[PDB]
């Protein structure tokens, strides 16, 4: 079993489909999409409703005390300026 021939003869196995020939070329391929998970830097194209929801989400889930304070201050400022500016109620 330690012999190493230049070419190895394939062995027929009963009850199994026949293997493809040695000269068969397989052109099937699979592709995966690379995505960069980073938000937009300027945050100016977003509307005031999306700003409200995003700042509420950061106020709830942010790991920075200053960031939570700034988000809460901003949503408090918009609620003080206009009570109607409450998309989430």
């Amino acid at each position: 079993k330690e012999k190493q021939k230049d070419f190895q003869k394939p062995k027929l196995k009963v009850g199994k489909p026949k293997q493809k020939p040695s000269n068969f070329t397989d052109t099937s391929f699979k592709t995966k999409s690379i995505v960069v998970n980073q938000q937009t830097l300027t945050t100016e194209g977003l509307d005031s409703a999306e700003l409200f929801k995003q700042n509420l989400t950061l106020a709830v889930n942010a790991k920075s005390d200053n960031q939570r304070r700034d988000a809460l201050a901003y949503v408090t400022n918009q609620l003080s300026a206009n009570p109607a500016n409450n998309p989430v109620g």
């Binding site: 190493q4 230049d6 000269n23 070329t25």
Partner: protein, 233 residues
């Protein structure tokens, strides 16, 4: 001056009064000068002169033969469609010189002390590193295959068509000296490689394009700077 001014000067004034006589005397002394050069030149100048005179003598005697004969094949008869045509399935070079492991690998010493560590082996012969090859991290690479010794194409010649095409290499199939050399992809004399034969128009019995075929290296790439191969047709 403009145009053929030296020719116009020769027309209007001639040449020196001794020019023809000195030319004739120099042509007459040419034989003595040639013999003196053959018997007194020394070194590389003498060797080049002797080779050039040998070439002139060959050309001259061929000219004599042609002017003398200005006024004047296989063993078995075969038809015109069997002309220029030629079991044991042997390769053109069935045996080459074996290569030792110092001739393949040298020792790359690493460390900072006076006694270095020599576990890294660098391959001295050219290699085919393969497709989509990225070098291993330096702490884990043992076999260094340098970039300047990597070859991606080979001058492969067709034995029947008698034409040589530069073809890409697909893999190294067998290096006869050692299976480790085949695993590393070393291109040496008598190495079987796989080449892309799409440019030769090789087709099967129904129309499928044959784009992979074995060839054998017939030169010494480490001494010649090129990979030369013969198709196994």
């Amino acid at each position: 001056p403009q145009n053929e001014y030296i020719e116009r000067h020769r027309k209007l004034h001639g040449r020196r009064l001794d020019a023809e006589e000195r030319a004739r005397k120099k042509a007459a002394r040419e034989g003595h000068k040639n013999s003196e050069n053959a018997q007194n030149l020394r070194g590389l100048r003498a060797k080049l002169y002797a080779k050039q005179r040998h070439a002139q003598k060959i050309q001259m005697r061929k000219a004599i033969k042609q002017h003398e004969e200005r006024n004047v094949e296989p063993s078995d008869p075969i038809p015109s469609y069997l002309l220029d045509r030629a079991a044991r399935f042997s390769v053109p070079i069935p045996k080459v010189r074996g290569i030792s492991e110092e001739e393949m690998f040298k020792v790359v010493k690493t460390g900072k002390k006076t006694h270095k560590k020599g576990w890294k082996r660098i391959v001295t012969k050219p290699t085919f590193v393969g497709p989509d090859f990225t070098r291993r991290p330096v702490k884990y690479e043992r076999f260094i295959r340098p970039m300047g010794l990597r070859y991606k194409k080979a001058n492969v010649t067709h034995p029947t068509l008698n034409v040589t095409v530069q073809l890409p290499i697909l893999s190294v199939k067998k290096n006869p000296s050692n299976p480790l050399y085949t695993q590393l992809g070393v291109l040496t004399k008598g190495t079987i490689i796989e080449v892309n034969v799409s440019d030769l128009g090789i087709v099967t019995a129904s129309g499928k394009i044959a784009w992979g075929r074995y060839a054998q290296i017939t030169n010494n790439p480490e001494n010649d700077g090129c990979v030369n191969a013969v198709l196994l047709v």
